[PDB]
Design a protein around this ligand. Structure first.
Ligand code: CLA
Ligand code: CLA
Ligand code: CLA
Ligand code: CLA
Ligand code: CLA
Ligand code: CLA
Ligand SMILES: CCCCCCCCCCCCCCCC(=O)OC[C@H](COP(=O)(O)OC[C@@H](O)CO)OC(=O)CCCCCCCCCCCCCCC
Ligand SMILES: CC(=O)O[C@H]1CC(C)(C)C(=C=C/C(C)=C/C=C/C(C)=C/C=C/C=C(C)/C=C/C=C(\C)C(=O)C[C@@]23O[C@]2(C)C[C@@H](O)CC3(C)C)[C@](C)(O)C1
Ligand SMILES: CC(=O)O[C@H]1CC(C)(C)C(=C=C/C(C)=C/C=C/C(C)=C/C=C/C=C(C)/C=C/C=C(\C)C(=O)C[C@@]23O[C@]2(C)C[C@@H](O)CC3(C)C)[C@](C)(O)C1
Ligand SMILES: CC(=O)O[C@H]1CC(C)(C)C(=C=C/C(C)=C/C=C/C(C)=C/C=C/C=C(C)/C=C/C=C(\C)C(=O)C[C@@]23O[C@]2(C)C[C@@H](O)CC3(C)C)[C@](C)(O)C1
Ligand SMILES: CC1=C(C#C/C(C)=C/C=C/C(C)=C/C=C/C=C(C)/C=C/C=C(C)/C=C/[C@@]23O[C@]2(C)C[C@@H](O)CC3(C)C)C(C)(C)C[C@H](O)C1
Lengths: 193, 178, 180, 40, 47, 107, 193
């Protein structure tokens, strides 16, 4: 929320708030919550996308039969860029609707993030507490509870690392897509991608 | 004491524009004396917002378009009127404008609503009252710029026949020559 | 600076329905302010009746393509040519059944005043509760709000199904699956 | 609009004109969709 | 139907018509919706 | 000489489309007898865009007249002293209305 | 600002203000501030332009390519004056863009040279204090801070030197332009000009 309390300050920009254009000074502190929720969501989606894109460029795919006749290698033949278009529309819709359920359940939680909740703290158990619905209580984030061994300071440091790696992953995934769309724009990319 | 406009300092102030954002006194033709300020300002904000969306959309459609719509900016209106996708905008904007005319009727009758205030502020920009006046002035500035921007966009596009910049062919060369 | 804004359209004054005790009142959705003119109880009685009819219709319309009453003549998977093809003296008996129910339920109470002349008589409380869910008063508000919302959604859904069938000429599921 | 304009629209001639225009529209559209119906 | 995103690209690039000679004022005035006899008739709602 | 002037078309609702008689020029409508066609030919109108634009101008003038009627009763109404200036009224209607009207039409 | 208070008088005209016309005595106070700022701007522009024209006439040009297909030698082959037409329009566009930025930023500073600001004192770090804009704190004047090792009286002497050099510079640049346009008007300008 308030641009201050948030933890994202790091050594790369000096130990200060990095707001060159003063976007944070023209908001009423209600929108800074939305910006840290969206920043963390962007960073997390971006690092997932980055590792997935690197996997696709390397050519690693599942053993086969994404669908009935289609194979994983065949549907990822033309690199990772066209892989999404190649994937079956039905499975595409199932990915989209499970993401819809996740991102609707995350929004429906009572404290929210904009209205006085933690911006970034996705609820661990999105589908519980819903009358008339049942799910097998598998918590969305950290299902195996890796974070129990971590103390407060350690998880603060790891949240800092999360923000840094998410920002770097945003830069990386945009580099990948831009390098594909404009050859030679990202010189560290080979013909694989 | 006599009040002079800050934009036309050779004229006396209208005195009807008091207590409004962007009040440099630009009203030489005295529309505020005849029509009410609430109606005039609601019209101003409507034009500002529609012009901002229009000037962004014109430039955007000059570059990218959806797969179904393979028309250029100029023929997009006719093509989409034929297709029926402008009726779908006139029905869902006309619903919005039915609610809007109810609102402007209420505020002209003195409900309490401001000229162009719909309360639409989901993300909370300017929820602090200190920043709201500055953001209102910035809204008006950007919208009044966007009106001329869209006018230039359409007129120069038709006049030149060029896609994004709306510049004659000779203007892309030797325009800084002695 | 509206003194009493509408909870749904906050740039409009509060309608009379907002300051009332029927269920679902807070939304306050009434841009046209029809609650000031129309009697509010009479309109909840109509809202509930329409919603009940529509939430019987929408599952019926959506599942009559998939399933047939065993041996029924004149069946067609799409409702419009189904009603065109079905024998008129079946639709007549359905309408007679509905009319008998309506007349006997609303005996001597068919006008805005005669209905709700009795102060006890509530909007849409026709007394149809064989299983007596209404005796449990803890969940009565939940069930009332759920009935209202489901009825409204069913009105919109049935309208959409019927008009999509008009557009496409094909039943609901076929028309939907030919999009993707 | 206001109680005053609603009362004016509720005046007798305005209501008669509106209602008879609605009736004429209903009759005209019924004629369009079921034209030339001499008997039931 | 081409659902943009799943069975079709989200946004297709627009046709770049290239910078070239200007049109004539008569050329785009005898096709306008308000200053052309046939343009006026092509501006009536079809419906 | 050959074409019959016509500027009204009836919709087909109850068989009244028979009233859209053959007026020549591949057009079906009700023949008019107001002389407006000859009036416009004298005025020099040769296309329909001109008719459309003068119609829009007439609509603007009608709106202006409604506004003026509202303004001169509800906002700024003259006085009886203003009304009783018959000499000035005659001067303006002779030289200003009729005289300049004839001059402008002659031009 | 006011004529007697300005460091304009020099030993060229008998240590007295040189206004043969009645301008300075006919104009009000702020017109003199405008004129002094304009004098400094003209002097400095011509002081750079005369050196640039001399270098162009001499033919000393950077080793490299101005664009991927154009050489500094190619654009300088047509003499110092035609080099402006020879250089790419998309490059002189950037030059005029940065000049536009500098002029607007200098004009936007508050005290204002006509409203209680020092005329001819272009504000250092013109791109600071601007909402929605960041630029590194590189001073427009003396980026290496040469003025730090100077005293106030020495700085006044150098201001006088600046003015007397700039006036001669505008004389020189108009001499170059007239020598190119009218041949033989200005001697000492060989065929290279
Ligand atoms: C013909 C279809 C149909 C039917 C019969 C119903 C029936 C119901 N809906 Mg509705 N609903 C429908 C379509 C339908 N809906 C559609 C298409 C939507 C849009 C997504 C909704 C969205 C919706 C919402 C958002 C809610 C309802 C709720 C309800 C319930 C009302 C309150 C109640 O008594 O719950 C008491 C509870 C029960 C009787 C048991 C729980 C319901 C079971 C799980 C139903 C069977 C589901 C089936 C296995 C498919 C799963 C996928 C009731 C069971 C409300 C509710 O309380 O739901 C629990 C509710 O919150 N519905
Ligand atoms: C460290 C990684 C890296 C490297 C080595 C390069 C290298 C290159 N990129 Mg870049 N690029 C990168 C990351 C990188 N890119 C990323 C992450 C993206 C995604 C956003 C892009 C997107 C991109 C595009 C879209 C394009 C390039 C292009 C280029 C080429 C020329 C760029 C240039 O003139 O820079 C000049 C750099 C400087 C003058 C110094 C920068 C510092 C100044 C002071 C900042 C000024 C800020 C300004 C005022 C605001 C060059 C091969 C261009 C090309 O040739 O494509 C074929 C091109 O069109 N890149
Ligand atoms: C009071 C006497 C009278 C009567 C009994 C009728 C009866 C009728 N007129 Mg009408 N008619 C009347 C006066 C009368 N007219 C007058 C005064 C005029 C002059 C304006 C007309 C002009 C007129 C026209 C021009 C037409 C009729 C038609 C009709 C028929 C309408 C049926 C219909 O479309 O229902 C449809 C209802 C549902 C589907 C429900 C019906 C036979 C129409 C017709 O079809 O005639 C055969 C028709 O075209 N009438
Ligand atoms: C139900 C049909 C449907 C489905 C399943 C999808 C699915 C998708 N679209 Mg979308 N799209 C649709 C209809 C649909 N679209 C329509 C009708 C249009 C025309 C207006 C578009 C225009 C469109 C564009 C321009 C783009 C996509 C893209 C996408 C992808 C990203 C979605 C996203 O970020 O959501 C975020 C969700 C929200 C912001 C919530 C919106 C409001 C909710 C749904 C209510 C995804 C594959 C992107 C793509 O190509 O990815 C590869 C992309 O660039 N779509
Ligand atoms: C209000 C009526 C009116 C108006 C607006 C005009 C307007 C014009 N007349 Mg004039 N004209 C008028 C009445 C009018 N005329 C009358 C009554 C006569 C008859 C005596 C003429 C005879 C006349 C001639 C002979 C010429 C003009 C011309 C002109 C032009 C004026 C040039 C200038 O200002 O110098 C302009 C098109 C000149 C022109 O441009 O003609 C094409 C020109 O040669 N007019
Ligand atoms: C355009 C450039 C320019 C400008 C704006 C000024 C401005 C000024 N000079 Mg001048 N000056 C200039 C060029 C300029 N100078 C040049 C080239 C020289 C060298 C000969 C001098 C030498 C000089 C001296 C020695 C002194 C001044 C002083 C002044 C100031 C007071 C006099 C006055 O009112 O001038 C107002 C100026 C104008 C309104 C400009 C009018 C230009 C006319 C219209 C055209 C001239 C054409 C020209 C002859 C063509 C030659 C080729 C004033 C700030 C005095 C000062 O600072 O006292 C405190 C002072 O002592 N100047
Ligand atoms: C186009 C997509 C855009 C949305 C359009 C509308 C459809 C979705 C609406 C569902 C609202 C239904 C609605 O009433 O939800 C609103 C409801 C409000 O939340 P509650 O207050 O119940 O939950 C918060 C706490 O009470 C929980 O303890 O949310 C839920 O119950 C929790 C969210 C579950 C969300 C998971 C289900 C997602 C929907 C199913 C995904 C498939 C959609 C069908 C396609 C196959
Ligand atoms: C050199 C040159 O010229 O250009 C360069 C520039 C250019 C183009 C930008 C390049 C690029 C791309 C870049 C920079 C890509 C960066 C990608 C990035 C930064 C990707 C992060 C992923 C993070 C993930 C998946 C995290 C998982 C995290 C998981 C599963 C966990 O929760 C771990 C954890 O549970 C454990 C196990 C237990 C606890 O102990 C701690 C926690 C709870 C946290 C290139 C290719 O380098 C070339
Ligand atoms: C497989 C895969 O990946 O497929 C993808 C890849 C592919 C093909 C690339 C795709 C695409 C195309 C897409 C998504 C294109 C997106 C285009 C988009 C979104 C284009 C925005 C333009 C914004 C403008 C011009 C704004 C100017 C704004 C201006 C002038 C300002 O800066 C205003 C300013 O006030 C600020 C803000 C700050 C102030 O300090 C300074 C000033 C006053 C100047 C798809 C559809 O995604 C599919
Ligand atoms: C006889 C005859 O007829 O001749 C003909 C031919 C001839 C002569 C060719 C002609 C001509 C042209 C003329 C008169 C041209 C004149 C050109 C002129 C007058 C050009 C000045 C440049 C000054 C610059 C670049 C200053 C940089 C200054 C810099 C970078 C600094 O700040 C230096 C400094 O910061 C340090 C590093 C340290 C500090 O501690 C001190 C300071 C602040 C000082 C004529 C008119 O046609 C007449
Ligand atoms: C903000 C504001 C106002 C406003 C406004 C304005 C001007 C708003 C404008 C909004 C706008 C312009 C919104 C477009 C949406 C387009 C969509 C959803 C497209 C769907 C497209 C679909 C579903 C499909 C397209 C297809 O191509 C597909 C994909 C497949 C092809 O086979 C063919 C078809 C056709 C099927 C007021 C009210 C005037 C006043 C107020 O004061 C301020």
């Amino acid at each position: 929320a308030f641009v201050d309390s948030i933890e994202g300050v790091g050594e790369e920009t000096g130990n200060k708030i990095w707001d060159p254009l003063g976007i944070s000074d023209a908001v009423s502190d209600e929108a800074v919550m939305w910006f840290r929720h969206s920043e963390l969501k962007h960073g997390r989606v971006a690092m997932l996308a980055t590792v997935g894109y690197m996997i696709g460029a390397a050519g690693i795919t599942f053993p086969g039969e994404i669908a009935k006749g289609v194979t994983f290698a065949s549907v990822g033949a033309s690199g990772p860029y066209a892989a999404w278009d190649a994937t079956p529309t039905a499975g595409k819709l199932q990915i989209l609707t499970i993401i819809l359920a996740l991102e609707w359940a995350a929004e429906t939680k009572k404290p929210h993030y904009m209205r006085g909740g933690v911006p970034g703290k996705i609820d661990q158990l999105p589908f519980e507490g819903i009358p008339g619905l049942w799910a097998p209580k598998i918590k969305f984030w950290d299902p195996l509870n890796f974070m129990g061994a971590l103390t407060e300071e350690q998880k603060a440091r790891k949240r800092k690392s999360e923000l840094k790696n998410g920002r770097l992953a945003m830069i990386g995934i945009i580099s990948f897509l831009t390098g594909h769309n404009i050859p030679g724009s990202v010189p560290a990319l080979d013909s694989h991608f | 004491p006599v009040e002079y406009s800050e934009s036309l300092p050779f004229l006396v102030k209208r005195k009807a524009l008091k207590g409004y954002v962007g009040d440099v006194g630009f009203d030489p033709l005295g529309f505020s004396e005849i029509l009410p300020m609430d109606w005039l300002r609601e019209a101003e904000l409507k034009h500002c917002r529609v012009a901002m969306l229009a000037t962004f959309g014109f430039g955007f459609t000059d570059f990218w378009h959806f797969p179904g719509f393979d028309y250029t900016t100029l023929e997009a209106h006719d093509a989409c009127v034929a297709s029926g996708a402008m009726s779908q905008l006139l029905l869902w904007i006309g619903l919005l404008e039915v609610f809007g005319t109810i609102g402007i009727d209420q505020t002209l009758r003195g409900s309490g609503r401001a000229a162009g205030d719909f309360g639409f502020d989901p993300l909370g920009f300017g929820s602090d009252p200190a920043k709201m006046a500055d953001l209102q002035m910035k809204e008006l500035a950007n919208g009044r710029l966007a009106m001329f921007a869209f006018s230039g966009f359409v007129t120069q596009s038709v006049l030149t026949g060029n896609q994004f910049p709306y510049l004659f062919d000779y203007q892309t060369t030797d325009v800084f020559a002695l | 600076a509206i003194a009493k804004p509408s909870n749904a359209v906050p740039f409009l004054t509060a309608p009379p329905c907002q300051s009332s005790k029927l269920a679902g009142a807070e939304t306050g959705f009434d841009p046209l302010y029809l609650s000031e003119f129309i009697d509010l109880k009479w309109a909840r009685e109509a809202e509930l009746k329409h919603g009940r009819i529509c939430m019987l219709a929408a599952p019926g319309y959506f599942f009559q393509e998939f399933f047939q009453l065993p041996g029924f003549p004149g069946y067609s998977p799409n409702g419009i040519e189904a009603v065109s093809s079905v024998s008129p003296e079946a639709l007549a008996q359905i309408v007679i059944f509905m009319s008998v129910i309506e007349y006997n339920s609303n005996l001597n109470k068919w006008t805005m005043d005669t209905m709700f002349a009795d102060p006890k008589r509530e909007p849409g409380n026709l007394g149809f509760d064989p299983l007596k869910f209404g005796e449990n008063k803890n969940t009565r508000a939940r069930l009332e709000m759920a009935e209202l919302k489901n009825g409204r959604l069913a009105m919109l859904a049935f309208s959409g199904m019927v008009h999509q069938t008009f557009v496409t000429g094909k039943p609901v599921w076929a028309s939907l699956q030919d999009i993707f | 609009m206001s109680n005053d304009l609603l009362k004016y629209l509720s005046t007798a001639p305005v209501l008669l004109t509106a209602w008879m225009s609605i009736t004429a529209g209903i009759i005209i559209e019924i004629q369009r969709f079921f034209p030339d119906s001499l008997s039931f | 139907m081409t659902i943009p995103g799943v069975n079709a690209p989200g946004l297709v690039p627009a046709t770049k018509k290239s910078v070239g000679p200007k049109p004539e004022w008569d050329s785009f005035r005898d096709t306008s919706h308000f200053w052309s006899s046939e343009g006026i008739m092509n501006s009536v709602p079809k419906v | 000489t050959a074409i019959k002037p016509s500027a009204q078309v009836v919709w087909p609702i109850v068989g009244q489309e028979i009233l859209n008689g053959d007026v020549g020029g591949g057009f079906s409508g009700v023949q008019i007898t107001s002389g407006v066609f000859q009036m416009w030919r004298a005025s020099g109108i040769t296309n329909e865009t001109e008719l459309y634009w003068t119609a829009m101008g007439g609509l603007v003038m009608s709106a202006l007249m409604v506004f003026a009627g509202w303004f001169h009763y509800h906002k700024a109404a003259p006085k009886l002293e203003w009304f009783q200036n018959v000499e000035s009224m005659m001067n303006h209607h002779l030289a200003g209305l009729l005289g300049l009207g004839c001059l402008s039409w002659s031009g």
